[PDB]
């Protein structure tokens, strides 16, 4: 095997890790249909300020997904839910969250962190002024909100509350100072993962060498080299005949290259002897 | 050209991992995530 | 302004078979010298279709179905059908999308609207420019708000035969939804052309709302307000099987679905449009 000699990291412009309140700085979280949205774009961020803080508690990713970032904007997601309904925040995972409150993206996924508010965001009868939906006609795709603040029709026939039989389409969490931990308020912020890159800096195109290469969206060793390959403007990259990808548009200078992997192969030894000989030479 | 096409798109079988890309494997999930994904697609692709 | 018409006439139901409609680029990857079979979300070959004749007392755009997804097509003399409501409601009780070309932007938001009973641009009719966008009249408790680059399209009644036709795809998907943009010049007196146009990517827009209905916002036409004359269809969206055909530069050239006939159903088994004569094994039933 050929080892490589080079670092390919490609980029566009570059900014610096930004601090983020709205990951960890927040003091009242809202309801979870309702789910504020305050987004992350165009820096170069770790979160680890997720970590690097005093409100917050959890610290899990759903924690090797921290750092699953060379995508677009990230959307840090600001939320109460119960610890009956911490386990729903999930891609896909079909609860009273993620089918009707907050569903989540699955190309890659972030972090969602609670932290324990049994003092502040709770009560003895419960803090029912927070809700959640546990019954509507219509399922949530990801990555929606459900702002609607109107009395709801439990089958899609006109059966509006305050009539009889009617139903709300908000139960209470109870979120009792006297329960366990299955029934408080967590302030949760969760990284919805659907520009920013963690290993973003810019290198050397060391071309027509076996190197390492990193890019927006393509990762891996071989030969670099510009192509001719006709990409159309809203074309990324190129594959081969097989499904492996040999060309891509430069991330920083749209030059539109070829991946040729690197040089391999067998080795054979021709010899003509012991009793002959002790010399031999290799193919 | 077919006994080629069947060893190249047996490549892209999941073989009960969450993919079947080592490195996906390997970087994205967690170690522990790992080894149980990495030694599925390996024992796969052996017998392949 | 909340507004209504003086009449809103049914559609002539004119019925036509969609012949080589709804192909788009679905990915970034460029291939070349290549066959590649794929199922996504397309518009099926042959579909019958119906002719929204909208013509100078006739409006259609009620609540119409969307679920996952819709195929577009309209071809335009005077360049009415220009923006689309997407929500599930279609009344201020949930979050919805405006998406309305004004004939100077692409405005674009996600909130919960005050939406008016009648969606149309409320637009002067001998020389072709908005007065106000009548179909919200403000927006409560809003995720999203975006303005395009400036350009102009002039949207006045046009005479003769249509010169216009745009190809539109919408499509749900992790928040971002997928608005795919074709085009072609034509010269059209009655449903559709026949004929390949493919679609491009333009818009990756996360807009968070429960997208289960649409409603098309034509574009009223009085100097009580009318509209005039446009063709234009709705389709559907549907997970079958189709070959991509790409020439030597990367453009999709043709298309075969599998699901048409037993002919058709044979090209993806051999990934070819050349099939010798013979008996093939195709698929169980
Ligand atoms: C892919 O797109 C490229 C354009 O970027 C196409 O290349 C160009 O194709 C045209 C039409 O074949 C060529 O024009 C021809 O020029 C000759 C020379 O005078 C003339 O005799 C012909 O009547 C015709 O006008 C053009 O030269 C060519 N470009 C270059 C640089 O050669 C290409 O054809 C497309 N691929 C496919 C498979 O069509
Ligand atoms: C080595 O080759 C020679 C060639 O004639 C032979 O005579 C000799 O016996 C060989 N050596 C052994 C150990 O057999
Ligand atoms: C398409 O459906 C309509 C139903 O309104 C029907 O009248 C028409 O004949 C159908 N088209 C064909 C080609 O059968």
């Known amino acids: ?283 | 050209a077919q006994a080629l096409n069947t060893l190249v798109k047996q490549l892209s079988s999941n073989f009960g991992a969450i993919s079947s890309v080592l490195n996906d494997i390997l970087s994205r999930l967690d170690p522990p995530e790992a080894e149980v994904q990495i030694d599925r697609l390996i024992t796969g692709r052996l017998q392949s | 302004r909340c507004t209504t018409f003086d009449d809103v006439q049914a559609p002539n139901y004119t019925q036509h078979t969609s012949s080589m409609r709804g192909v788009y680029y679905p990915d970034e990857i460029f291939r070349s010298d290549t066959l590649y079979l794929t199922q996504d979300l397309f518009l099926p070959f042959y579909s019958n279709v119906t002719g929204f004749h909208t013509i100078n007392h006739t409006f259609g755009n009620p609540v119409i179905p969307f679920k996952d997804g819709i195929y577009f097509a309209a071809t335009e003399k005077s360049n009415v059908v220009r923006g689309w409501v997407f929500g599930s409601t279609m009344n201020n009780k949930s979050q919805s999308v405006i998406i309305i070309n004004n004939s100077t932007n692409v405005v674009i938001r996600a909130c919960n609207f005050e939406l008016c009973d009648n969606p149309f641009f409320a637009v002067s009719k001998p020389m072709g420019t908005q007065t106000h966008t009548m179909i919200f009249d403000n927006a409560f408790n809003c995720t999203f708000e975006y303005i395009s680059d400036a350009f102009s399209l002039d949207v006045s009644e046009k005479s003769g035969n249509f010169k216009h036709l745009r190809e539109f795809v919408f499509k749900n998907k992790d928040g971002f939804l997928y608005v795919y943009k074709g085009y072609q010049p034509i010269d059209v007196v009655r449903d559709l052309p026949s004929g390949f146009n493919t679609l491009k990517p333009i818009f990756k827009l996360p807009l968070g709302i429960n997208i289960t209905n649409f409603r098309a916002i034509l574009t009223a036409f009085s100097p009580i307000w009318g509209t005039s004359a446009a063709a234009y269809f709705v389709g559907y969206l549907k997970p079958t099987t189709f070959m991509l055909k790409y020439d030597e530069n990367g453009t999709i050239t043709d298309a075969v679905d599998c699901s048409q006939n037993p002919l058709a159903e044979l090209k993806c088994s051999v990934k070819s449009f050349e099939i010798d004569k013979g008996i093939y094994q195709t698929s169980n039933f």
């Open chain 1, 1 to 283: 095997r050929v080892v490589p000699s080079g670092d390919v990291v490609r980029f566009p412009n570059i900014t610096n890790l930004c601090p983020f309140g709205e990951v960890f700085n927040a003091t009242k979280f809202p309801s979870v249909y309702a789910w504020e949205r305050k987004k992350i774009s165009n820096c170069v961020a770790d979160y680890s300020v997720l970590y690097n803080s005093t409100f917050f508690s959890t610290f899990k990713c759903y924690a090797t997904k921290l750092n699953d970032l060379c995508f677009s904007n990230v959307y840090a997601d600001s939320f109460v839910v119960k610890g009956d309904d911490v386990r729903q925040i999930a891609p896909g995972q079909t609860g009273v969250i993620a089918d009707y409150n907050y569903k989540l993206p699955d190309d890659f996924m972030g972090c969602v962190l609670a932290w324990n508010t049994r003092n502040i965001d709770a009560t003895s009868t419960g803090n029912y002024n927070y809700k959640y939906r546990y019954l509507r006609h219509g399922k949530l795709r990801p990555f929606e909100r459900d702002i609607s603040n109107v009395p709801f029709s439990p089958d899609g026939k006109p059966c509006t509350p305050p009539a009889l039989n009617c139903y709300w389409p908000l139960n209470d969490y109870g979120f009792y100072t006297t329960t366990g931990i299955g029934y408080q308020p967590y302030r949760v912020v969760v990284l919805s993962f659907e520009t920013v890159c963690g290993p973003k800096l810019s290198t050397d195109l060391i071309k027509n060498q076996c190197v390492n290469f990193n890019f927006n969206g393509l990762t891996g060793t071989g030969v670099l080299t510009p192509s001719s390959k006709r990409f159309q403007p809203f074309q990324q990259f190129g594959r081969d005949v097989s499904d492996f990808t040999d060309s891509v548009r430069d991330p920083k200078t749209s030059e539109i290259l070829d991946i040729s992997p690197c040089a391999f192969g067998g080795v054979s030894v021709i010899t003509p002897g012991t009793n002959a000989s002790s010399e031999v030479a290799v193919l």
